[PDB]
Every structure is written in C-alpha cells, then in structure tokens.
Design an enzyme around this catalytic site. Structure first.
Site, PDB file in Angstrom:
ATOM      1  N   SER A  45      -3.887   2.888  -1.840  1.00  0.00           N
ATOM      2  CA  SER A  45      -3.662   1.776  -1.087  1.00  0.00           C
ATOM      3  C   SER A  45      -4.363   0.117  -1.818  1.00  0.00           C
ATOM      4  CB  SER A  45      -4.222   1.865   0.213  1.00  0.00           C
ATOM      5  OG  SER A  45      -3.306   2.917   1.130  1.00  0.00           O
ATOM      6  N   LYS A  48      -1.963  -2.698  -2.286  1.00  0.00           N
ATOM      7  CA  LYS A  48      -1.551  -3.647  -1.240  1.00  0.00           C
ATOM      8  C   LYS A  48      -1.994  -5.116  -1.423  1.00  0.00           C
ATOM      9  CE  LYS A  48      -0.753   0.525   1.551  1.00  0.00           C
ATOM     10  NZ  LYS A  48      -1.131   1.468   2.249  1.00  0.00           N
ATOM     11  N   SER A 105      -4.495  -0.104   5.921  1.00  0.00           N
ATOM     12  CA  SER A 105      -3.880   0.936   5.054  1.00  0.00           C
ATOM     13  C   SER A 105      -2.449   1.390   5.889  1.00  0.00           C
ATOM     14  CB  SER A 105      -4.430   2.028   4.674  1.00  0.00           C
ATOM     15  OG  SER A 105      -5.396   1.468   3.630  1.00  0.00           O
ATOM     16  N   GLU A 141       5.323   4.169  -0.716  1.00  0.00           N
ATOM     17  CA  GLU A 141       4.611   5.173   0.222  1.00  0.00           C
ATOM     18  C   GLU A 141       5.517   6.335   0.773  1.00  0.00           C
ATOM     19  OE1 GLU A 141       1.533   5.203   0.443  1.00  0.00           O
ATOM     20  OE2 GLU A 141       0.730   3.138   0.032  1.00  0.00           O
ATOM     21  N   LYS A 209     -10.660  -4.114  -0.430  1.00  0.00           N
ATOM     22  CA  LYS A 209      -9.549  -3.071  -0.161  1.00  0.00           C
ATOM     23  C   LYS A 209      -9.700  -1.793  -0.718  1.00  0.00           C
ATOM     24  CE  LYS A 209      -5.590  -1.556   1.431  1.00  0.00           C
ATOM     25  NZ  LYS A 209      -6.388  -0.478   2.099  1.00  0.00           N
ATOM     26  N   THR A 210      -9.466  -0.621   0.109  1.00  0.00           N
ATOM     27  CA  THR A 210      -9.771   0.792  -0.256  1.00  0.00           C
ATOM     28  C   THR A 210      -8.450   1.367  -0.558  1.00  0.00           C
ATOM     29  OG1 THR A 210     -10.161   1.385   1.805  1.00  0.00           O
ATOM     30  CG2 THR A 210     -12.073   0.486   0.723  1.00  0.00           C
ATOM     31  N   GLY A 211      -8.608   2.618  -1.242  1.00  0.00           N
ATOM     32  CA  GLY A 211      -7.462   3.566  -1.202  1.00  0.00           C
ATOM     33  C   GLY A 211      -7.787   5.023  -1.094  1.00  0.00           C
ATOM     34  N   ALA A 212      -6.956   6.048  -0.730  1.00  0.00           N
ATOM     35  CA  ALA A 212      -7.357   7.367  -0.927  1.00  0.00           C
ATOM     36  C   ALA A 212      -5.918   7.994  -1.330  1.00  0.00           C
ATOM     37  CB  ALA A 212      -7.803   7.933   0.398  1.00  0.00           C
TER      38      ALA A 212
END
Lengths: 265, 164
Positions: A45, A48, A105, A141, A209-212
C-alpha cells in the site's frame, strides 16, 4: 539503545527476513543512514502515495478535479474496502478516494484511482517521467501484494522511494497546493499506529503511509522530525519473513526508535 | 467492551438502534462521521493496514433509526472453505443463493455485506458473500477467494482472485 544500523541488523536476524531502509535529509536529499537501500522490496500500500501524486499532477494540469464524483459497482470491489464499500450507493469524490487509499489502505479506492491514471502502466510511466527509473507498478489490488521471492513486479528500492517522495513533496513536479494536500493525506494516516507512530515523541511531526503484503512483506514511508517540523524521510521495508504481523510491527517500531534516539548525529 | 469480534457482529441484529449497536460493540471500538457519514464503523484488533472491522448502516440519522445494513471483513471465518476455480466456474448468474452454496461448498462462504433497502421488508435485499479456498481466509498456498453478489437471493455477478 543500539545504533540504527545495529538495530536493523538485529531485526533482520530476528525476523529471518530482509530489511531495507534509508534515512534521507528532506531539504538536501543527502543520504544519512542506509541498509540495502538499492535492493528491491514490494511496495504494497505504500504505492498509494505515488498513485495520489499522479492524481494531483493531473489536477495541476486541469485534467482532473478532486471534487469530481466517481460512481462504481459491486464488480469494482476488491478485498479490504471499508470506505468504498460504505459509499457504494453514493459514489466518492477523487479527493475522498485518495484520502481512503492513503489513510485507510482502502484497496478498491486505489483501483478506482489507478484507472484514472492509465493503470499500473500509466502510473509507472509517471514514475519514469519524474526520473524514477527503478520503481514499478505492474498489477492492481490485491495481486500487487503477492510479494513472490525475487519477482521485480510492484517493487521499489528504499533509495528510489525516498527520492520520489522528496520529488513529489518538495520539487516543482507538483504545485505547492498539491504538495500540501499529498502531505496532508499522509499526516492523516489512520492505520499506522503500530509502527513509527508508536515510538514517536510528542511534539514531533509525522506524515506516513504503510503497507502489508504476503510472505511477511511490511513497510512504512515517512516524513518526520522534532519541533513539529518535517526534517527527514525514513523508508523501512521488510520482506521474506515468516514472522507474525505483530512481530513485524514491533521490529519496524524498534528501527524507528533507534533512528529517533540517535537522531542528532 | 473488549475488541470488536465476530461474536459481537453476530449479536448485533438488523432492526437495532445506534445505542444498541454501540452497547454491544463497545463504543471505544467504534466511530461515526468522517469517512463513514452516519454509519457506525467498529474496529477489530489494531494490526495496522487491513485491520478487521464491521460497518453498520441505519435507516436514517434519527436516534430511533434501525440497522438496515451490516458489513464486515475479517471478523467471521468460513466453517469449511473448499472453493476451487472449477467450482467457481460452475456458478452462473441467475442461480439462487441455495444453488450457489451447493456448488461452492456449504461452508465456503461468509457474509460480507447485507442490506435491506425496504427494511423490515426483504424486498430488494442485496447480499455479498465472500467465499474461500482452504487457505483463502487465512497463510497457506490455496489462497483463492471470491465475491458473489445477489439481489433478492439471486446471483447478479461474481469475481475471483488467486483461485486454482
């Protein structure tokens, strides 16, 4: 307590994964701390932010408006869509979609925005246009989260992502208004609590901003600094670790804590 | 109180007021306004990205308004997930919910979203199921899932990801 590089090595060891990070001075763009900064990691993510940079560039050009309403249907939904699912009947504005993608997200929101910029190919073309010759988006996605070992699709490097964030937020690539708006969405991130925010002293600026992803993929891109002023960009990615979400959260936080404790230097 | 859970999601019924929903969910888990308008969004474990949640929609903004809409992700597990691509391909628009479950596996699905536009009447009810291969809701190789959506208990469409 331990120095940032030593904490990073410890994290990599404990995770049995690979860690990639960079710390970059925002104003000068100079590299301050780096580990595997030229190696590839799935964006998840974190892409983005780049996505909404592309959206804002179209806004600057007059080809888009944040107030434009987009309507969509059941067929447009992918897994994890808290905000876009709620607004199925009413539609969402472009600005609301960026807020959802960045702050929550929301996956379907990102897919709707992706279509406006010519898909992954179009977003990657934007990347190349701004002089990022490394970062690439290939899928939509949720497949972009797959994080297959060694697969270059949907990856960046810590160094490339840090430079690109600096370009979007401080260069003439985006208008001043678009710079402030992109920053604002990252300031308003709702789902980044367990990471750098968990170890961030009161009185510090943070925008993130994070992501997994799969196979232990986890990441944060952040701007932070003392005295409520953005000073440095910090990008931390994890990949190829069997560790739980919580352990992965804890390790990124620990790396953040080391950078913060050893900030001066 | 405690975290929002599948148990609490199941406890909450269509027809309940906002106060009843908050009472069961635990107000410390829930939020309204902002991105959610006059719906109530209740949060599971704070894992970061893709945290489990429910969202409850109401007939109006009135205090006495009733739940006409229940959505969730990652709060309820399928009881026996066995969806495959071949099974998914055997599903056709026009099938009843009953016919769908016989095709994809009786324990393969959970309810993603369910809305009653004429609540308490079931006329026009819309239903989205999420359905899963053996590891679709987990970790594990068989990670396929699908979204199947119905109006009046009849399939209007389907989409899948990662199925084999």
């Amino acid at each position: 307590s331990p120095q940032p590089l030593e904490q990073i090595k410890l994290s990599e060891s404990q995770l049995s994964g690979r860690v990639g990070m960079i710390e970059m001075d925002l104003a000068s763009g100079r590299t301050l701390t780096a580990w595997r900064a030229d190696e590839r990691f799935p964006m998840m993510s974190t892409f983005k932010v780049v996505l909404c940079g592309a959206v804002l560039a179209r806004v600057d050009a007059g080809d888009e408006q944040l107030e434009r309403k987009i309507h969509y249907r059941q067929q447009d939904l992918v897994k994890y869509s808290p905000v876009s699912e709620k607004h199925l009947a009413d539609g969402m504005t472009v600005g609301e979609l960026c807020a959802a993608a960045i702050t929550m997200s929301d996956n379907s929101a990102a897919n709707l925005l992706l279509a406006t910029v010519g898909g992954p190919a179009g977003l990657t073309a934007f990347l190349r246009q701004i002089g990022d010759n490394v970062t690439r988006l290939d899928r939509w996605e949720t497949e972009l989260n797959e994080a297959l070992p060694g697969d270059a699709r949907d990856t960046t490097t810590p160094a490339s992502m840090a430079a690109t964030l600096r370009k979007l937020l401080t260069s003439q690539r985006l208008s001043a208004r678009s710079q402030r708006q992109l920053l604002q969405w990252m300031v308003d991130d709702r789902v980044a609590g367990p990471l750098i925010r968990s170890v961030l002293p009161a009185g510090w600026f943070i925008a993130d901003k994070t992501g997994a992803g799969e196979r232990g993929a986890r990441g944060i891109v952040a701007l932070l600094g003392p005295n409520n002023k953005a000073e440095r960009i910090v990008v931390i990615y994890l990949r190829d670790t069997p560790a739980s979400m919580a352990e992965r959260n804890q390790q990124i936080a620990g790396i953040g804590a080391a950078l913060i404790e050893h900030w001066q230097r | 109180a405690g975290v929002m859970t599948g148990a609490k999601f199941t406890q909450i019924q269509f027809g309940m007021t906002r106060q009843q929903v908050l009472d069961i969910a635990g107000a410390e888990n829930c939020e309204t306004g902002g991105s959610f308008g006059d719906s109530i969004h209740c949060r599971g474990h704070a894992a970061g990205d893709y945290y489990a949640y429910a969202t409850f929609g109401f007939t109006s903004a009135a205090a006495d308004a009733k739940v006409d809409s229940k959505s969730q992700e990652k709060l309820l597990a399928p009881s026996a997930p066995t969806l495959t691509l071949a099974k998914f391909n055997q599903v056709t628009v026009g099938m009843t919910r009953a016919q769908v479950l016989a095709t994809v596996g009786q324990g393969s699905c959970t309810t993603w979203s369910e809305y009653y536009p004429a609540y308490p009447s079931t006329a026009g009810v819309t239903l989205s199921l999420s359905c899963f291969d053996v590891d679709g809701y987990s970790t594990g190789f068989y990670r396929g899932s699908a979204h199947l959506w119905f109006t009046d208990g009849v399939l209007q469409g389907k989409r899948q990801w990662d199925l084999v």
